[PDB]
Each structure stands twice: as C-alpha cells, then as structure tokens.
Design an enzyme around this catalytic site. Structure first.
Site, PDB file in Angstrom:
ATOM      1  N   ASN A 124       0.770  -1.228  -0.297  1.00 22.99           N
ATOM      2  CA  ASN A 124      -0.202  -0.106   0.280  1.00 22.99           C
ATOM      3  C   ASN A 124       0.988   1.207  -0.169  1.00 22.99           C
ATOM      4  O   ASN A 124       0.126   2.241   0.044  1.00 22.99           O
ATOM      5  CB  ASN A 124      -1.234  -0.027   0.632  1.00 22.99           C
ATOM      6  N   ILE A 146       1.381   6.869  -0.614  1.00 24.63           N
ATOM      7  CA  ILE A 146       0.202   6.241   0.395  1.00 24.63           C
ATOM      8  C   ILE A 146      -0.607   6.006  -0.247  1.00 24.63           C
ATOM      9  O   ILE A 146      -1.717   6.880  -0.237  1.00 24.63           O
ATOM     10  CB  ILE A 146       0.270   6.424   1.870  1.00 24.63           C
ATOM     11  N   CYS A 147      -1.512   5.059  -0.176  1.00 26.38           N
ATOM     12  CA  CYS A 147      -2.414   4.339   0.012  1.00 26.38           C
ATOM     13  C   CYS A 147      -3.091   3.892   1.649  1.00 26.38           C
ATOM     14  O   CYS A 147      -2.996   2.986   1.583  1.00 26.38           O
ATOM     15  CB  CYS A 147      -2.886   3.174  -1.383  1.00 26.38           C
ATOM     16  N   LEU A 148      -4.204   4.936   1.427  1.00 22.79           N
ATOM     17  CA  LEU A 148      -4.331   4.636   2.915  1.00 22.79           C
ATOM     18  C   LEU A 148      -5.922   6.019   2.487  1.00 22.79           C
ATOM     19  O   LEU A 148      -5.849   7.012   2.540  1.00 22.79           O
ATOM     20  CB  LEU A 148      -3.640   5.419   4.278  1.00 22.79           C
TER      21      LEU A 148
END
Length: 156
Positions: free
Chosen positions: A84, A92-94
């Site tokens: 991620n 960042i993937c969040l």
C-alpha cells in the site's frame, strides 16, 4: 502564518505527540522543518513482529491551509517494500488520507494509523502492484524482501 484555527490545531497536536505514551516508547515523533508549520517531518518505528521491526521511517508531512478540514499530505521519505506504499515514490494508499479524513483526527492518530498500516497490508487494493503481487503469490519472499529493505533503507 496560516489561519488561526490551523496554527492552533498544529501547535496543540505537536504538544500531543510530545506528551504521548507512544513517543515515550519511541514509536512516533514529529519535528519542525519550516519557520512556519506548513511542512513537518514525521518518524515512525516499524511495528514489532513485522518485517519492518527495528526500522525507522521518515515521513514528509504537508499541512494544507484548510487544516483541520482536509487531511495532511503524507509521503514516505524512507524507502519501504509494502503493498500500500509506492516502492518508488513513497506515495501512500490509505483512506484517512483521502475520503475518510475527519476533522477530529490529529498528527498523532495519522502517525499511529500509518504504523497500523505497516502491520496490516491490504494487497487487494494496492498502491504498488509489483509488491502486492509478491505479497499474494510468494509471501515468504515478500517477507525476506521487506526485511532486507528495512536493513538497507530504514536502519533495521
């Protein structure tokens, strides 16, 4: 300076990080960069019992003029091998950094959420496809690779 609400929020949140039990354990940290408060430098410890254990990760944190109503922009400066997070850019993937930001959130909870992400990858909704594929198809070699990168880049 930024608007009063933004300046007061950031000062309060810097104090919160300083006074936290998690900084007393050396898990999270935030430091100044500017003479202002539009960029900060975060650091998080790799969680225990992960390939990131022993590592420390520097984070580029950019505070918007609209804080606290929009999230900080955050990127890993320190390179990391995680489904991620981009192994190239540190992007960042969040969800909390996009559509699920809430104004009640803080520098402290952002840092702690990033640590939790290190302990709980979501490879089915990845940022880095190559890493995510390895995570799924060869988890043993994913672990060896992530550990190596923690030693190579993060001081593990």
């Amino acid at each position: 300076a930024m608007a009063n609400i933004a300046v007061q929020r950031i000062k309060r949140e810097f104090k919160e990080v300083l006074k936290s039990e998690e900084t007393s354990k050396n898990q999270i940290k935030v430091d100044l960069v500017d003479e202002n408060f539009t960029e900060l430098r975060g650091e998080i410890a790799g969680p225990p019992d992960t390939p990131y254990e022993g590592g420390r990760y520097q984070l580029e944190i950019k505070i918007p003029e609209t804080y606290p109503f929009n999230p900080p922009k955050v990127r890993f400066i320190t390179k990391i091998w995680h489904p991620n997070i981009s192994s190239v850019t540190g992007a960042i993937c969040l969800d909390i950094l996009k559509d699920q930001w809430a104004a009640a959130m803080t520098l402290r909870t952002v840092l702690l959420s990033l640590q939790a992400l290190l302990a709980a990858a979501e490879p089915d909704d990845p940022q880095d496809a190559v890493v995510a594929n390895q995570y799924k198809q060869n988890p043993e070699m994913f672990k060896q690779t992530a550990r190596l990168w923690a030693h190579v880049y993060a001081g593990a």
